[PDB]
Ligand binder design. Sequence first.
Ligand code: FMN
Length: 109
Amino acid sequence: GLRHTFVVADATLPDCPLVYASEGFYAMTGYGPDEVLGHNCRFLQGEGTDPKEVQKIRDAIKKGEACSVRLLNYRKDGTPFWNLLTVTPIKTPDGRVSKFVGVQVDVTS
Ligand SMILES: *[C@@]12=NC3=[C]C([C])=C([C])[C]=C3N([C][C]([O])[C]([O])[C]([O])[C]OP([O])([O])=O)C1=NC(=O)[N]C2=O
């Protein structure tokens, strides 16, 4: 298949911190678990990140809906790369959102 990464966000906490990331996620971005875990994924964002696309993710999280955007992210070394992101809400049986799962694909080609 195509190369991709994977993270899990804990919705039971208010700002959706990351609680597990795939080895590809650390290797793609250059950040380590000690600088990724516990934090919201937005640290990957930067000057060229489109605020309208960011808005689409922020609303989907509030609304508990899946979303797919294309964002300009930045590695730890500041170099940019294009990240196609799909966020999926994971619900408990009672309809409540417990976790958000994100597949990140570098589509810089
Ligand atoms: C990020 N991946 C990512 C993965 C999950 C599971 C979730 C829930 C969010 C992301 N984001 C977005 C970020 O965490 C945040 O939700 C948005 O920026 C909108 O909220 P704010 O308050 O900051 O406007 C991801 N953002 C990225 O830029 N790159 C990803 O890989």
